[PDB]
Design an enzyme around this catalytic site. Structure first.
Site, PDB file in Angstrom:
ATOM      1  N   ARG A   1      -4.213   5.229   8.045  1.00  0.00           N
ATOM      2  CA  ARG A   1      -4.465   4.231   7.016  1.00  0.00           C
ATOM      3  C   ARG A   1      -5.345   3.129   7.586  1.00  0.00           C
ATOM      4  O   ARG A   1      -5.300   2.831   8.784  1.00  0.00           O
ATOM      5  CB  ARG A   1      -3.158   3.628   6.476  1.00  0.00           C
ATOM      6  CG  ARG A   1      -3.288   3.015   5.101  1.00  0.00           C
ATOM      7  CD  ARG A   1      -1.995   2.365   4.636  1.00  0.00           C
ATOM      8  NE  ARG A   1      -1.420   1.492   5.651  1.00  0.00           N
ATOM      9  CZ  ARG A   1      -0.208   0.951   5.576  1.00  0.00           C
ATOM     10  NH1 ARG A   1       0.560   1.180   4.519  1.00  0.00           N
ATOM     11  NH2 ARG A   1       0.235   0.169   6.551  1.00  0.00           N
TER      12      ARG A   1
ATOM     13  N   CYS B   1       0.084  -3.861  -0.092  1.00  0.00           N
ATOM     14  CA  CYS B   1      -1.352  -4.120  -0.146  1.00  0.00           C
ATOM     15  C   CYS B   1      -2.029  -3.246  -1.194  1.00  0.00           C
ATOM     16  O   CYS B   1      -2.584  -3.748  -2.177  1.00  0.00           O
ATOM     17  CB  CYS B   1      -1.983  -3.884   1.227  1.00  0.00           C
ATOM     18  SG  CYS B   1      -1.369  -4.950   2.548  1.00  0.00           S
ATOM     19  N   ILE B   2      -1.979  -1.930  -1.008  1.00  0.00           N
ATOM     20  CA  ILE B   2      -2.556  -1.023  -1.990  1.00  0.00           C
ATOM     21  C   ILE B   2      -1.901   0.345  -1.833  1.00  0.00           C
ATOM     22  O   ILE B   2      -2.472   1.382  -2.197  1.00  0.00           O
ATOM     23  CB  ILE B   2      -4.089  -0.972  -1.845  1.00  0.00           C
ATOM     24  CG1 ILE B   2      -4.724  -0.415  -3.117  1.00  0.00           C
ATOM     25  CG2 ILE B   2      -4.503  -0.225  -0.585  1.00  0.00           C
ATOM     26  CD1 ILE B   2      -4.366  -1.227  -4.341  1.00  0.00           C
ATOM     27  N   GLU B   3      -0.683   0.349  -1.304  1.00  0.00           N
ATOM     28  CA  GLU B   3       0.098   1.565  -1.191  1.00  0.00           C
ATOM     29  C   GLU B   3       0.694   1.919  -2.548  1.00  0.00           C
ATOM     30  O   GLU B   3       0.754   1.094  -3.460  1.00  0.00           O
ATOM     31  CB  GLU B   3       1.202   1.399  -0.146  1.00  0.00           C
ATOM     32  CG  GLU B   3       0.715   1.515   1.295  1.00  0.00           C
ATOM     33  CD  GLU B   3      -0.603   0.796   1.536  1.00  0.00           C
ATOM     34  OE1 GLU B   3      -1.641   1.484   1.630  1.00  0.00           O
ATOM     35  OE2 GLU B   3      -0.609  -0.454   1.588  1.00  0.00           O
TER      36      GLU B   3
ATOM     37  N   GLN C   1       6.674  -1.784   2.444  1.00  0.00           N
ATOM     38  CA  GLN C   1       6.712  -2.139   1.035  1.00  0.00           C
ATOM     39  C   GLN C   1       7.632  -1.195   0.257  1.00  0.00           C
ATOM     40  O   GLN C   1       7.939  -0.074   0.684  1.00  0.00           O
ATOM     41  CB  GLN C   1       5.298  -2.127   0.450  1.00  0.00           C
ATOM     42  CG  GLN C   1       4.385  -1.064   1.034  1.00  0.00           C
ATOM     43  CD  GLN C   1       4.889   0.340   0.778  1.00  0.00           C
ATOM     44  OE1 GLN C   1       5.362   0.649  -0.313  1.00  0.00           O
ATOM     45  NE2 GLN C   1       4.800   1.196   1.788  1.00  0.00           N
TER      46      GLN C   1
END
EC number: 4.4.1.38
Length: 825
Positions: free
Chosen positions: A673, A463-465, A188
């Site tokens: 992660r 995603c949620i990085e 990402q």
């Protein structure tokens, strides 16, 4: 009992009623009705013109080849003006839902895709016979022996290749130590969109032209290493401005032929936009949206960014334009929502296509994570909630598509009005927004070299990085490691049922002959450490190999450090940069519960023998339902049960301790992660029956959520188990994805919203990185499974993203159905 707003909108749609939000969003509803739920088509234009240029520039510096190829794309790609659209910008000539091709990444999969994509179980795509001919005759031939995936395949040593791929060509994964750099150009990313809004690509080009003129003509480093980078950024600046100008020309040709004076006025205004931006700084809110929209759309043509290119803190960098235009009386909230949602419609038409089987299994339901960040803190440290923040929440509730990928930032001083509106948006029942905890990732990032100004202004990515768009420099896709296969290998002497007699892991012996818990735990630790060693060795090869195959001229010119040191982002080391990489711990809940069942029921309570256990596993519990039912009585992760949580804490300690020791010698942070994509489905499909009672080939536990149906102590216990299985004394960690499902009655009314707010505040105090919510009744899913055409608009939160439930394979649907729906808090 009671239905969520999404379920009620679903019943009205099925009953033939107009959606209650259609009239106040009429233009964008008209737009999305033209493609909603249409099988996307493969478009070949980007890949064709990209290939035409690359074939003529072989041997030249890679970043300069990229810019020349993008200029060939910009000159030749189809430019169109869609009806009722207020925005210009598109990456294909096909109308409706479309995806594009990246042969430099995975060109060796092109023949496979041509015959397998239209009927593939995960995220299928059509390809017309005209498109197929261009692919197999003009795109695929050049790339044979030249793609990144082929290079990665031939570069892995034997013992690493055996845990990576099943076939010698790397076309089929084994889903043990899964590389993810072959089905996306990079991980990402978030561009520095505000530098385009404030300076324009003409300003950046000017900065680079000053650097080009300052080079020492006699310095070999200046002329061989720096000059090609500078020339590439200059050329790619002209490329995107030319691309926007072609859209302006198309809008004027459209205006001349339009009889509607109202639409003609719009088309002229759109032409005026593309003639000013992104070349020049934006002057109003409309131009700012069009400028940002041009950049992210052009980025898709540049490379296949992981999860699709993300967008940053829109509610912040659009805000000066919003406040100025609102106070000037040239804008309204309703007009703001029309501009923004025209951007969602455009993004919803672009489908991120994964043509390899592994990439399809990782991204079910046309998965996408173009993160849009709202809320949080200012670079100076105060709360950043403003009027744009609430409009994005309002837009997300009323706009019926699962776009955009809305992520809300939470910190310890988040206002109550903000948390209340977030809670009410979550109660809508479509899974939005996802939450990211300032309190967890900011202290980790300043610990890893970030200043407080950079960390406070982070944008959610993927995603949620999180990303710091002028400090982050790491772009290499990491390994996804199946630690559930480590449990299976500990049972079957380093072998897996799926792969027969292939010696995959350590020969730890036949687990039937194990005499103590110590002996089985040692067997697992050996396979556990083996997966870790294979993960990092694979990653280091990926880092070195990607540097030879990927460049990102536009993305680099948007990075202050790349402009300063004149080096492309996809190079391994960039001066002053910070490198945040990842490896994935997959199957946490499955691994914990399996080991806990063995320790408790075999060696402490002696309630069964290893022979009974492995007899039941090898039979897939057929004829052994008594042992399966017995296994489900052991302590499980997600109940605030220290018996299970202490095992998970030690599993985490092994991965984090390993990451802290061996990441630095690769020159990066390679942190543990727990973010799954949908890979917990294919990872489960290669793991046979497990000691926690899970049948063979069933999906693993998603992310760091509890195993399906293992949480018998309420939703708050899930938060405590996540906290109790972490190691806050070390830093070699990243995000953990948490999925929690509530029934609508659980969170009913103002009393329910208050309970959800206090739940979010507890999630925040515990320094948990992420959390997501489904608010739905189980019967909705069961009815959608049986009659998928009637319920084809049902939207569920999967893993970082929401998707249409009927687009999901049965395995992934079973994951959704088996997740515990909590009726009380």
């Amino acid at each position: 009992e009671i239905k969520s707003p999404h379920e009620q909108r679903l019943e009205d749609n099925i009953a033939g009623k107009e959606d209650i939000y259609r009239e106040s969003h009429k233009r964008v509803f008209k737009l999305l009705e033209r493609f909603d739920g249409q099988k996307p088509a493969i478009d070949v234009e980007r890949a064709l013109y990209f290939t035409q240029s690359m074939a003529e520039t072989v041997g030249q510096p890679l970043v300069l080849r990229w810019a020349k190829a993008l200029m060939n794309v910009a000159k030749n790609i189809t430019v169109m003006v869609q009806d009722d659209q207020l925005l210009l910008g598109r990456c294909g000539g096909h109308d409706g839902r479309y995806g594009i091709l990246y042969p430099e990444l995975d060109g060796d999969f092109l023949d496979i895709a041509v015959r397998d994509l239209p009927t593939r179980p995960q995220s299928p795509a059509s390809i017309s016979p005209e498109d197929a001919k261009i692919v197999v005759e003009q795109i695929a031939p050049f790339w044979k022996g030249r793609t990144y995936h082929e290079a990665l395949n031939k570069a892995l040593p034997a013992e690493v290749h055996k845990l990576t791929y099943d076939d010698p060509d790397g076309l089929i994964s084994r889903f043990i130590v899964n590389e993810t750099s072959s089905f996306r150009s990079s991980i990402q990313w978030v561009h520095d969109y505000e530098v385009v809004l404030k300076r324009g690509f003409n300003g950046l080009k000017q900065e680079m032209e000053e650097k080009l003129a300052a080079l020492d003509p006699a310095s070999p480093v200046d002329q061989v290493d720096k000059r090609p980078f500078i020339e590439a950024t200059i050329l790619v600046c002209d490329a995107i401005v030319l691309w926007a100008k072609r859209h302006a020309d198309a809008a004027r040709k459209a205006a001349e032929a339009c009889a509607d004076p109202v639409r003609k006025a719009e088309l002229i205004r759109m032409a005026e936009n593309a003639e000013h931006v992104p070349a020049n700084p934006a002057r109003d809110f409309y131009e700012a949206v069009q400028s940002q929209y041009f950049t992210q759309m052009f980025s898709r043509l540049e490379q296949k960014t992981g999860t699709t290119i993300s967008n940053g803190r829109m509610d912040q960098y659009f805000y000066p334009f919003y406040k100025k235009d609102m106070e000037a009386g040239i804008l309204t909230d309703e007009k703001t929502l029309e501009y923004l949602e025209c951007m969602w419609v455009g993004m919803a038409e672009f489908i991120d296509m994964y043509i390899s089987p592994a990439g399809g299994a990782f991204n079910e339901g046309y998965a996408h994570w173009e993160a849009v960040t709202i809320g949080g803190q200012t670079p100076d440290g105060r709360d950043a909630t403003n009027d744009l923040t609430y409009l994005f929440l309002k837009s997300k509730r009323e706009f019926p598509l699962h776009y955009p990928d809305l992520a809300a930032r939470i910190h310890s001083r988040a206002p109550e009005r903000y948390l209340w509106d977030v809670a009410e948006t979550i109660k809508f029942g479509s899974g939005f927004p996802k939450l990211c905890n300032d309190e967890e990732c900011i202290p980790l990032y300043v610990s890893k070299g970030a200043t407080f100004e950079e960390a406070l202004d982070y944008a959610v990515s993927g995603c949620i990085e999180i990303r710091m768009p002028n400090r982050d420099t790491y772009t290499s896709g990491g390994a996804y490691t199946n630690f559930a296969s480590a449990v299976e290998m500990a049972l079957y002497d380093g072998k897996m049922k799926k792969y027969g007699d292939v010696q995959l892991g350590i020969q730890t012996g036949d687990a039937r002959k194990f005499k103590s818990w110590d002996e089985f735990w040692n067997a697992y630790v050996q396979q556990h450490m083996l997966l870790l060693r294979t993960t990092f060795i694979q990653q280091y090869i990926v880092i070195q190999t990607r540097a030879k195959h990927f460049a990102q001229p536009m993305g680099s010119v948007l990075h202050a450090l790349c402009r300063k040191h004149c080096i492309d982002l996809h190079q391994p080391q960039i001066p002053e940069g910070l490198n945040f990489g990842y490896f994935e711990f997959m199957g946490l809940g499955t691994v914990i519960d399996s080991l806990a069942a063995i320790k408790k029921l075999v060696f402490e309570d002696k309630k069964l023998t290893m022979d009974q256990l492995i007899d039941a596993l090898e039979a897939n519990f057929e004829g052994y339902e008594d042992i399966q039912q017995l296994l489900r009585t052991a302590p499980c992760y997600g109940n605030d049960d220290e018996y299970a949580d202490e095992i998970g804490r030690e599993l985490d300690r092994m991965a984090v301790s390993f990451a802290a020791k061996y990441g630095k010698e690769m020159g990066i942070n390679n942190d543990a992660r727990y973010v799954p994509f949908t890979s917990h489905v294919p990872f489960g499909k290669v793991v046979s029956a497990t000691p926690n009672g899970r049948v063979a080939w069933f999906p693993l536990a998603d992310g760091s959520s509890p195993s399906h149906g293992a949480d018998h102590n309420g939703p708050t216990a899930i938060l405590l188990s996540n906290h109790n299985t972490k190691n806050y004394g070390m830093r070699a960690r990243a995000a953990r994805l948490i999925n929690v499902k509530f029934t609508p009655k659980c969170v009913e009314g103002d009393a329910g919203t208050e309970k959800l707010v206090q739940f979010i505040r507890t999630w925040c105090d515990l320094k948990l990185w992420h959390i997501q919510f489904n608010v739905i009744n189980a019967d909705t899913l069961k009815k959608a499974q049986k009659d998928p055409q009637k319920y084809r608009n049902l939207i569920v939160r999967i893993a970082g993203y929401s998707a249409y439930f009927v687009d999901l394979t049965p395995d992934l649907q079973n994951d959704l159905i088996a997740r515990t729906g909590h009726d009380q808090m």
